[PDB]
Design an enzyme around this catalytic site. Structure first.
Site, PDB file in Angstrom:
ATOM      1  N   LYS A  13       0.822  -1.205   0.000  1.00 14.24           N
ATOM      2  CA  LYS A  13       0.000   0.000   0.000  1.00 14.24           C
ATOM      3  C   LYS A  13       0.860   1.261   0.000  1.00 14.24           C
ATOM      4  O   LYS A  13       0.388   2.342  -0.348  1.00 14.24           O
ATOM      5  CB  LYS A  13      -0.937   0.008   1.206  1.00 14.24           C
ATOM      6  CG  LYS A  13      -0.233   0.164   2.545  1.00 14.24           C
ATOM      7  CD  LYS A  13      -1.199  -0.053   3.698  1.00 14.24           C
ATOM      8  CE  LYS A  13      -0.576   0.323   5.031  1.00 14.24           C
ATOM      9  NZ  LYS A  13       0.682  -0.424   5.310  1.00 14.24           N
ATOM     10  N   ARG A  88      -5.052  -0.247  14.423  1.00 16.02           N
ATOM     11  CA  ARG A  88      -5.011  -1.666  14.074  1.00 16.02           C
ATOM     12  C   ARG A  88      -6.100  -2.442  14.802  1.00 16.02           C
ATOM     13  O   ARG A  88      -6.350  -3.610  14.501  1.00 16.02           O
ATOM     14  CB  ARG A  88      -3.645  -2.262  14.412  1.00 16.02           C
ATOM     15  CG  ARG A  88      -2.493  -1.602  13.691  1.00 16.02           C
ATOM     16  CD  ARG A  88      -1.158  -2.084  14.217  1.00 16.02           C
ATOM     17  NE  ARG A  88      -0.239  -0.965  14.406  1.00 16.02           N
ATOM     18  CZ  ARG A  88      -0.131  -0.251  15.525  1.00 16.02           C
ATOM     19  NH1 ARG A  88      -0.878  -0.534  16.589  1.00 16.02           N
ATOM     20  NH2 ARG A  88       0.733   0.752  15.580  1.00 16.02           N
ATOM     21  N   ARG A 123      11.242 -13.423  -4.216  1.00 13.51           N
ATOM     22  CA  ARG A 123      12.418 -12.596  -3.961  1.00 13.51           C
ATOM     23  C   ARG A 123      13.690 -13.420  -3.819  1.00 13.51           C
ATOM     24  O   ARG A 123      13.674 -14.527  -3.284  1.00 13.51           O
ATOM     25  CB  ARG A 123      12.226 -11.753  -2.699  1.00 13.51           C
ATOM     26  CG  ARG A 123      11.597 -10.398  -2.949  1.00 13.51           C
ATOM     27  CD  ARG A 123      11.208  -9.720  -1.645  1.00 13.51           C
ATOM     28  NE  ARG A 123      10.133  -8.751  -1.837  1.00 13.51           N
ATOM     29  CZ  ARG A 123       9.409  -8.227  -0.853  1.00 13.51           C
ATOM     30  NH1 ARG A 123       9.636  -8.577   0.408  1.00 13.51           N
ATOM     31  NH2 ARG A 123       8.451  -7.354  -1.130  1.00 13.51           N
ATOM     32  N   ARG A 156      15.562 -14.324   2.164  1.00 12.92           N
ATOM     33  CA  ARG A 156      15.489 -13.815   3.527  1.00 12.92           C
ATOM     34  C   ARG A 156      14.674 -14.744   4.418  1.00 12.92           C
ATOM     35  O   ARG A 156      13.726 -15.382   3.962  1.00 12.92           O
ATOM     36  CB  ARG A 156      14.871 -12.416   3.545  1.00 12.92           C
ATOM     37  CG  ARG A 156      15.711 -11.340   2.879  1.00 12.92           C
ATOM     38  CD  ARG A 156      17.053 -11.177   3.569  1.00 12.92           C
ATOM     39  NE  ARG A 156      17.713  -9.928   3.201  1.00 12.92           N
ATOM     40  CZ  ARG A 156      18.941  -9.591   3.580  1.00 12.92           C
ATOM     41  NH1 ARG A 156      19.658 -10.414   4.336  1.00 12.92           N
ATOM     42  NH2 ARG A 156      19.460  -8.432   3.201  1.00 12.92           N
ATOM     43  N   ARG A 167       1.732 -14.493   9.170  1.00 14.59           N
ATOM     44  CA  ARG A 167       1.622 -13.047   9.295  1.00 14.59           C
ATOM     45  C   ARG A 167       0.274 -12.556   8.771  1.00 14.59           C
ATOM     46  O   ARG A 167      -0.348 -11.671   9.360  1.00 14.59           O
ATOM     47  CB  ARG A 167       2.764 -12.370   8.536  1.00 14.59           C
ATOM     48  CG  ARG A 167       3.072 -10.949   8.978  1.00 14.59           C
ATOM     49  CD  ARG A 167       4.294 -10.414   8.252  1.00 14.59           C
ATOM     50  NE  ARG A 167       5.451 -11.291   8.429  1.00 14.59           N
ATOM     51  CZ  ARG A 167       6.343 -11.580   7.484  1.00 14.59           C
ATOM     52  NH1 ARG A 167       6.237 -11.066   6.264  1.00 14.59           N
ATOM     53  NH2 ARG A 167       7.351 -12.393   7.762  1.00 14.59           N
TER      54      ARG A 167
END
Length: 214
Positions: A13, A88, A123, A156, A167
């Protein structure tokens, strides 16, 4: 122009942040940024929030809210602000209303989980130099190896498929009621709410914001 920008972790975003900032001349603000800018200041809250962090405890809703009200009180927020990733939870959002921190628009940058996962696990990185690649969009000249050094690329620990998925599940679990809250607040005329589709190209998403905002 006061905007709240929400979105899942890895949705991207932030890709529209600078557009909104330049469109209406407002700073971008996150709880993380002000947590530091407060400690930097000689503010009582800064000294307060500093102790809580050094002790490794979560910052209380009341203290965060106080930092926000303090942040938007500054002159750079003369024409409004872009509040990124906050609130949140519903208690936090209600605490903003209890202190009279209204907003004009609540934007939800929406990207299906599966797409986010696909973006992230693609990635690749050259750890020692920090050079980043991606199996699509920007692949290395030599497959699996860094262009510069020729060393093998890795991934990573923060981008592990299993890690990313937890997550998202965690995020949706924590954000679901809040989205309904602001959507209901919109039906009450207190603010405007719009669920932006972040799967379309950047230039397309940008043009959708102009029709939503003005």
């Amino acid at each position: 122009m006061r905007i709240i920008l929400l979105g899942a972790p890895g949705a991207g975003k932030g890709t529209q942040a600078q557009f909104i900032m330049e469109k209406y001349g407002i700073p971008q603000i996150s709880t993380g940024d002000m947590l530091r800018a407060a400690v930097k200041s000689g503010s009582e809250l800064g000294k307060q929030a500093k102790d809580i962090m050094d002790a490794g405890k979560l910052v209380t809703d009341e203290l965060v809210i106080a930092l926000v009200k303090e942040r938007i009180a500054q002159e750079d927020c003369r024409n409004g602000f872009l509040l990124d990733g906050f609130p949140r939870t519903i208690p936090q959002a209600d605490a903003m209303k209890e202190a009279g921190i209204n907003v004009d628009y609540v934007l939800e940058f929406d990207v299906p989980d599966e797409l986010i996962v696909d973006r992230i696990v693609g990635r690749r990185v050259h750890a020692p130099s920090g050079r980043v690649y991606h199996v699509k969009f920007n692949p290395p000249k030599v497959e699996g190896k860094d262009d510069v050094t020729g060393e093998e690329l890795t991934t990573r620990k923060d981008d592990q498929e299993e890690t990313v998925r937890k997550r998202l599940v965690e995020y949706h679990q924590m954000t679901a009621a809040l989205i309904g809250y602001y959507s209901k607040e919109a039906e009450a005329g207190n603010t405007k709410y719009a669920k932006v589709d972040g799967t379309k190209p950047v230039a397309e998403v940008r043009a959708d914001l102009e029709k939503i905002l003005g």
